[PDB]
Structure formats: structure tokens, C-alpha cells
From Swiss-Prot, chain A:
GO terms for cellular component: collagen-containing extracellular matrix; extracellular region; extracellular space. Glycans are attached at residue 106. This is Interferon alpha-2. Interacts with IFNAR2. It comes from Homo sapiens (Human). InterPro entries: 4_helix_cytokine-like_core, Interferon_alpha/beta/delta. One of its GO terms (biological process) is cell surface receptor signaling pathway via STAT. The keyword Endoplasmic reticulum does not apply. Disulfide bonds join 1-98, 29-138. Keywords: Antiviral defense, Cytokine, Disulfide bond, Glycoprotein, Pharmaceutical, Secreted, Signal. The keyword Cell cycle does not apply. GO terms for molecular function: cytokine activity; type I interferon receptor binding.
Curated annotation (Swiss-Prot), chain B:
Isoform 3 is detected in the urine (at protein level). Expressed in blood cells. Expressed in lymphoblastoid and fibrosarcoma cell lines. It is linked to Immunodeficiency 45: An autosomal recessive disorder characterized by increased susceptibility to viral infection due to impaired antiviral immunity, resulting in infection-associated encephalopathy. Affected individuals are at risk for developing fatal encephalitis after routine measles/mumps/rubella (MMR) vaccination. It comes from the Eukaryota. Glycans are attached at residues 31, 60, 89, 161, 165. Residues 1-212 are extracellular. The gene is IFNAR2. Phosphorylated on tyrosine residues upon interferon binding. Belongs to the type II cytokine receptor family. Heterodimer with IFNAR1; forming the receptor for type I interferon. Interacts with JAK1. Interacts with the transcriptional factors STAT1 and STAT2. Interacts with USP18; indirectly via STAT2, it negatively regulates the assembly of the ternary interferon-IFNAR1-IFNAR2 complex and therefore type I interferon signaling. The lineage of its organism: Eukaryota, Metazoa, Chordata, Craniata, Vertebrata. Together with IFNAR1, forms the heterodimeric receptor for type I interferons (including interferons alpha, beta, epsilon, omega and kappa). Type I interferon binding activates the JAK-STAT signaling cascade, resulting in transcriptional activation or repression of interferon-regulated genes that encode the effectors of the interferon response. Mechanistically, type I interferon-binding brings the IFNAR1 and IFNAR2 subunits into close proximity with one another, driving their associated Janus kinases (JAKs) (TYK2 bound to IFNAR1 and JAK1 bound to IFNAR2) to cross-phosphorylate one another. Disulfide bonds join 12-95, 58-66, 180-200. This is Interferon alpha/beta receptor 2.
Length: 165, 212
């Protein structure tokens, strides 16, 4: 498990890959203004020291499945997604590593599932929107923006050790 | 004569300056033939580009700047800037750009002084009397020190130092050292070097008569 915060390009790579898969720009898509909003209350709060690892694992599991769909594979670059799957697996393996070891990962009460449930419904909600929008180009950009912001409000929170007051 | 002809008819150069924790944006648009006098400023976030929100008092105004202290209260999200200019009663331009408060945040208006002592510099940045405890913003202030040509960037902790006069004592200096102090900030990069008007002060010189 990554106990010391020496250096990591895991989540930093995933975020970049999401931006690289960008076919278009939401900035030029003035129609799909139906944003979602990543559940940061159950990610950036309470959990900021390994406790957020179980959530991250299942969170990426949702991302992996959602992007590994026949829809996403046909919407984004299959070559970029090819690496995306590998990176997702890498992050997954890195996160579950702490679960395999005897680190303080699974110690919290049922609230551990609550965080996962929050992300679960968030992703399901996105799937519904995708179906409603027939998986349109700009609609995908919304998803990209959301997921990109999601990473900035999840794994990025572990690096958010600026203020302490 | 290079590239394309200078389009001095639609600059759309926007810039936001922080005047005592007050976000004020100004718009620059050179007029070639048609000269508009009234403009309308709109803003929004990345979350939804179509969520164009118009500012009050800064709509169909004859002003060239607009203040939105409590309007612009976000550090994580990006603020989109859309300026709709109308020449008389006809739409002329509607350039849409975006700003990042967590990347720019040009802070220059605050007054700052520096007392020069024989062996130390007494920096005194007069920041607004604002309670940081009620300010949801994360950033660092760097005190630049250019003494005798030696450029140094002192970045201390701003926790309880931006709520008024910022006192910073720079020691380990030798007599006769002209120094210039610059007040700029930083966040997660060094591209936020808002080098304000460098104030040069000369502390007591030691270039007197050399004797035993």
C-alpha cells in the first residue's frame, strides 16, 4: 500500500487520459446544460487518509464499466480507451493493494458502503442522461467534464493538504 | 507586415484585477469604424456554458469595468466571461473567454511599505481588514526581495497575515544593500507571478571610511 506520499502519477494520468479522449469541447456546446455534480460530501469529507480507498476502488469500477461499454468505446478513441482500461486497472490494483494488506482501509462502519452508494447512484444517473440524450457528442462532453471534476474532488482531495484551519 | 492584418476592430481582451479582495474585470475592444458606447457583461461556469448569467449594473452600461466581489465566489470552478457589445441598437460582438482565479488572481492595488534597517528589512504590506476565517480561498503570498541585484522569493505562511498589515522581517544582510520588494501570490504553480510595482529601499550604507 502507498503509505508514504512520495510520488504518484496514477490519478494524474487518468485525469489526463479523460482530457485526451475529448472529441469536442463543452465550451462550444451551448445546449447540454444539464450538469450533475459529483457527491463530494461522501468523498472529500470524513475520508482523507486511506479511508477513501475503498470508495475510490468501486468508483473506478463504475468508470471502467461505464467507459468499457460498447457506447463509450464507439464514442471515444478506442486506442485511448485501450490505455484507459489499463490505467484504470492500474489504479484499481494500486487501490485494492491496501485492501489486500493490513492497512486501515476496511475499519469504518456501514458508512463505507454509503460513500460507494453515493457514487453508484451518481453514475447510474449519468447513464440515464446518456440514454435520454442518445449518447450524443456534447452529452459525452458533459460526462467528461463531470468525471474530470469528480477526480478533482476525490483522489485529488488526498493531495489537498494546503490549509489546515 | 506578417501573419494576418491587425484586426483593430474587435480585441475582446478581458482582464480581472483584485482590488482589496474585490474582483473587478475590465474589457478592452479597439474600434475601427463602428464605435459602441454601451456594453453588457455576462458570466457563468464550466458546469454549464449555456448558463449565461448577466451582471447587475454591468448590463447595458456606459462603463468600462464591473465589480463582482460577492458574485465571483468560486475557486474550484472556472468563471466564463461573455461580453456582449452593441453599437447603438445593433449587436457588434459577443466574445466568450474564461478566467481562473486559482491561476491568475492579479493582486496589485494593496499598498505596501518597507522600512530599511542597517541589518534587516521590515516589510509592511497593508492588506484589507478582512477576516480570513470567513474567506474560502487557498493561496500563498510571496514577498520578493531584490537586494543589491540578488533576487530572492520569500514565501511565508499567510495564515493570519492577510487580515491587515503583513509584517515580514528579512535579516542576514550587509550594510548598503538597495532592495526592491514585490508583492505577488502563488497557488500550485509559478505562473501566477503578479510582480507588482517593485519598491526599492536603501538601508543605512556602510561604505564609510575604512580604518582600523
Amino acid at each position: 500500500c502507498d503509505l508514504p506520499q512520495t510520488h504518484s502519477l496514477g490519478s494524474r494520468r487518468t485525469l489526463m487520459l479523460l482530457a485526451q479522449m475529448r472529441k469536442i469541447s463543452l465550451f462550444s456546446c451551448l445546449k447540454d446544460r444539464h450538469d450533475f455534480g459529483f457527491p463530494q460530501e461522501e468523498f472529500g469529507n470524513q475520508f482523507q487518509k486511506a479511508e477513501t480507498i475503498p470508495v475510490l476502488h468501486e468508483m473506478i469500477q463504475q468508470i471502467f464499466n461505464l467507459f468499457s461499454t460498447k457506447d463509450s468505446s464507439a464514442a471515444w478513441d478506442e486506442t485511448l480507451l485501450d490505455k484507459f482500461y489499463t490505467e484504470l486497472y492500474q489504479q484499481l490494483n494500486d487501490l485494492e493493494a491496501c485492501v489486500i494488506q493490513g492497512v486501515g482501509v476496511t475499519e469504518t462502519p456501514l458508512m463505507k458502503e454509503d460513500s460507494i452508494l453515493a457514487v453508484r447512484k451518481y453514475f447510474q444517473r449519468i447513464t440515464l442522461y446518456l440514454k435520454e440524450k442518445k449518447y450524443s457528442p456534447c452529452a459525452w462532453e458533459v460526462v467528461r467534464a463531470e468525471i474530470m471534476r469528480s477526480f478533482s474532488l476525490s483522489t485529488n482531495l488526498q493531495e489537498s493538504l494546503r490549509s489546515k484551519e | 507586415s506578417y501573419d494576418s492584418p491587425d484586426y483593430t476592430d474587435e480585441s475582446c481582451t478581458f482582464k480581472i484585477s483584485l482590488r482589496n479582495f474585490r474582483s473587478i474585470l475590465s474589457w478592452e475592444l479597439k474600434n475601427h469604424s463602428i464605435v459602441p458606447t454601451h456594453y453588457t457583461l455576462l458570466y457563468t461556469i464550466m458546469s454549464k456554458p449555456e448558463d449565461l448569467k448577466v451582471v447587475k449594473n454591468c448590463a447595458n452600461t456606459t462603463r468600462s469595468f464591473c465589480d463582482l466581489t460577492d458574485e465571483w465566489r468560486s475557486t474550484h470552478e472556472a468563471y466564463v466571461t461573455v461580453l456582449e457589445g452593441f453599437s447603438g441598437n445593433t449587436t457588434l460582438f459577443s466574445c466568450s473567454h474564461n478566467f481562473w482565479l486559482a491561476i491568475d488572481m492579479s493582486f496589485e492595488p494593496p499598498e505596501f511599505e518597507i522600512v530599511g534597517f542597517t541589518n534587516h528589512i521590515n516589510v509592511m504590506v497593508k492588506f484589507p481588514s478582512i477576516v480570513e476565517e470567513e474567506l474560502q480561498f487557498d493561496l500563498s503570498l510571496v514577498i520578493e526581495e531584490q537586494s543589491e541585484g540578488i533576487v530572492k522569493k520569500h514565501k511565508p505562511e499567510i495564515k493570519g497575515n492577510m487580515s491587515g498589515n503583513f509584517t515580514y522581517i528579512i535579516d542576514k544582510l550587509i550594510p548598503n544593500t538597495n532592495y526592491c520588494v514585490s508583492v505577488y501570490l502563488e497557488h500550485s504553480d509559478e505562473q501566477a507571478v503578479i510582480k507588482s510595482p517593485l519598491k526599492c529601499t536603501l538601508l543605512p550604507p556602510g561604505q564609510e571610511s575604512e580604518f582600523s
